[PDB]
Amino acid sequence: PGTVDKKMVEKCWKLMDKVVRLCQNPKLALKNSPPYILDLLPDTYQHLRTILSRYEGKMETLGENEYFRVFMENLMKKTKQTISLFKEGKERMYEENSQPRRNLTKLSLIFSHMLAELKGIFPSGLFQGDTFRITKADAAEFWRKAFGEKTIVPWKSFRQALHEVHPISSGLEAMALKSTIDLTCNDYISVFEFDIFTRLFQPWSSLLRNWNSLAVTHPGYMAFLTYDEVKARLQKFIHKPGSYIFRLSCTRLGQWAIGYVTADGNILQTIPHNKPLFQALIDGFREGFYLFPDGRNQNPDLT
């Protein structure tokens, strides 16, 4: 990825400005629910303003930072992808449930994950990636042993290092793993993305078994789904209380969100606290709330 200079940031801001303008079309009927592109791109712009202001007179230093170069390349790529999506999707952009609109939702989620990562690595606008504090102690030991103080590593390097400690069974399993952990969809793994994955699929000691049980083979798991899409997907099960699905929370990254249909006819979403997801799903099944994953009659046995 090329060196970031002011001129590159200026170009990126112009591309983001074009996306924000496209997304103010009343035909789109965009909801303000997180992830909301008309909040995310302006917030990303403001945080980049902050970074640039902290590095006044240190732009050679900033422009050489490896994480920041990868981030800016990816932000430009994703913003161009969004502009192209509108150009190619034309009138299909305005149909809920069209593929182009699903793509725009997925891009909104990616912009949300990118902003969260940028704020995690550049809190207050200064680079602190090397000092990032990984949440799970056993995961932290892995990262520091394999990568030291690095903030970002290419997927190929991450895959190799992880396989030495937690063997990956197959090529297709590796691709599913990449799809799960590469939240910014840039073929790199940041220490921030690593922290999210190892919090979601803790304990480290059985990391990929947990992920296989909770995501790879579980019909309730929904990759890259938002709050409003969960509510929409459960609508068809409104007369089947106990139907449930679960996903990454977008606004509390590293935590799970479970959506479910109640016997009263509400579709509720809850973030488990003070219990791991395994126990939330087991207890919720036993107590009659989490019965039918994605509305299916059979539920995985996680005991």
């Binding site: 801001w13 924000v20 303000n32 997180p34 909301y36 979403q269 809850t270 107590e287």
Partner: peptide, 22 residues
């Protein structure tokens, strides 16, 4: 009138996450 990138200030609506059922 269409707002520019630097004119928008985030609304920051939050989705409703409710207490667990168990």
């Amino acid at each position: 009138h269409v707002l520019s990138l630097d004119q928008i200030r985030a609304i920051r609506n939050t989705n409703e996450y409710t207490e667990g059922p168990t």
